[PDB]
């Protein structure tokens, strides 16, 4: 390689030939938002005009419609997201984060032109659950740790507008990744598959 020393191209391929097989649940709430209904308590707390115990979000999918109940901090985020009734949205059940996908396809005729791509109605229930058995090479862990991809800082945006480069990953990063995959293999969270490296010529 021109980017990186000969021995590091071997060391990266020595790390491609070992795989984690790591299994985790995904759970999410998703659907067309039918209504946003904050629910008050008729008694306020002392000195304040009115008080909310929870927000109801009505969500629809091809299988049915359900009123989800959520803590009132959600309403702040549902005006960071520019949400309106008949959007389709999702909420990460493991995390409490909420996201907007777009206006639901049932409304794709209320103007002859409008500046959004319309989203087809989600199918299955309003609450979705599955297990997935994900797999990653230790080399994928080496690169994902060596060059993070979340953009909420100038070092990451600068590092992602700049040309991507192979870099001589330290024996310390290899060390820390070894120390933590042991932490999960001991707990039965992660399987390990010692693989094969094949070099021809």
């Amino acid at each position: 390689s021109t980017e990186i020393k000969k021995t590091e191209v071997l060391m990266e391929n020595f790390r491609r030939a070992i795989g984690l097989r790591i299994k985790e649940t995904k759970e999410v709430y998703e659907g067309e938002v039918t209504e946003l209904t904050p629910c008050e308590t008729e008694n306020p707390m002392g000195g304040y005009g009115k008080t909310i115990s929870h927000v109801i979000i009505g969500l629809k999918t091809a299988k049915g419609t359900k009123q989800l109940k959520l803590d009132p901090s959600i309403f702040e985020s549902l005006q960071k997201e520019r949400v309106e009734a008949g959007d389709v949205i999702y909420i990460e059940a493991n995390s409490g984060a909420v996201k907007r996908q777009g206006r639901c396809d049932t409304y794709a005729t209320e103007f002859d032109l409008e500046a959004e791509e319309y989203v087809p109605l989600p199918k299955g229930d309003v609450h979705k659950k599955k297990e997935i058995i994900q797999d990653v090479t230790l080399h994928d862990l080496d690169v994902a740790n060596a060059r993070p991809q979340g953009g909420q800082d100038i070092l990451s945006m600068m590092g992602q507008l700049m040309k991507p480069k192979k870099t001589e990953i330290t024996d310390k990063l290899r060390g820390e990744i070894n120390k933590v995959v042991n932490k999960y293999i001991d707990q039965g969270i992660a399987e390990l598959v010692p693989g094969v490296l094949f070099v021809d010529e």
Binding site: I22, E24, T25, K26, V28, E30, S73, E76, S77, K80, Y90, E92, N94, S95, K99, R100, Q101, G102, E117, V119, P122, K123, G124, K128, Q134, D135, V136, D140, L141, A144, N145, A146, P148, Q149, G150, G151, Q152, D153, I154, L155, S156, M157, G159, Q160, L161, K172, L173, G175, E176, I177, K179, V180, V181, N182, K183, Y184, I189
Partner: protein
């Protein structure tokens, strides 16, 4: 390079919306095993370790630990102790930030960025615009991260659970941006063998519970003893001869 930056900032917004659509349904082929769709060449979300999936999955977020603005040393064991009974226990393999005092090098010299004086009324507006930062869009883009993040940051005081800033304002280095140094108050101990000996005696006597008087010759020394005794929050009183009856 400004339009590069905005088209990047929008692409991250599009990544979370794409990942949900890409991972929670399988309606065969779009007209019975025919026709691709908008965004179908964007496969950077299909990797298990890609940021949208890595954030949606609760667990992989812990195997990609070296986030770009934290001082992570790696993992270590830790010990924790009760104040009563002196009983203690060990925490196995947890993340650690590096200590708050390894950042101690400095440039010997720090020059002003060079500037081109020019002898023309139209020309001097151009270097002025460069000294301001050449548009409010590009200035907000580096300083606060994107023009939406700047418009939001101007009102984030009004929001209960804010997001992090994206800009240069996302960063906070351990000393701040300036290299200028005020001596750390621990130096009072480590400059005097008498004051170092005194600190081990006061920790001895405070652990035993005894009440103590300290005598010194010089009011300038009593200032040094007081600044130490304040810094270690020992409780303190002084009665130099300049104190009123």
């Amino acid at each position: 390079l400004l339009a590069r930056w905005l088209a990047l900032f929008l692409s991250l917004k599009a990544s979370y919306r794409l990942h949900q659509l890409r991972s929670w349904g399988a309606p065969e082929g779009e007209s019975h095993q025919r026709y691709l769709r908008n965004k179908d060449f964007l496969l950077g979300v299909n990797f298990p370790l890609s940021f949208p999936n890595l954030c949606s999955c609760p667990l992989l977020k812990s195997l990609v630990f070296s986030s770009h603005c934290k001082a992570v040393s790696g993992y270590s064991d830790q010990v924790v102790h009760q104040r009563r009974s002196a009983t203690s226990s060990l925490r196995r393999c947890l993340l650690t930030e590096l200590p708050s005092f390894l950042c101690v090098a400095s440039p010997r010299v720090t020059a002003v960025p060079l500037d081109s004086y020019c002898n023309d009324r139209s020309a001097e507006y151009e270097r002025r615009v460069l000294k301001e930062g050449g548009s409010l869009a590009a200035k907000q883009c580096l300083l606060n991260g994107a023009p939406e993040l700047a418009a939001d940051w101007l009102n984030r005081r009004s929001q209960f659970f804010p997001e992090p800033a994206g800009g240069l304002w996302s960063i906070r280095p351990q000393n701040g941006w300036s290299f200028i140094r005020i001596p750390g108050k621990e130096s009072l101990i480590t400059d005097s063998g008498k004051l170092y000996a005194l600190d081990v005696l006061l920790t001895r006597l405070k652990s035993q519970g005894h009440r103590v008087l300290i005598y010194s010759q010089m009011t300038r020394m009593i200032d040094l003893l007081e600044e130490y005794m304040v810094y270690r929050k020992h409780t303190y009183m002084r009665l130099d001869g300049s104190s009123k009856i």
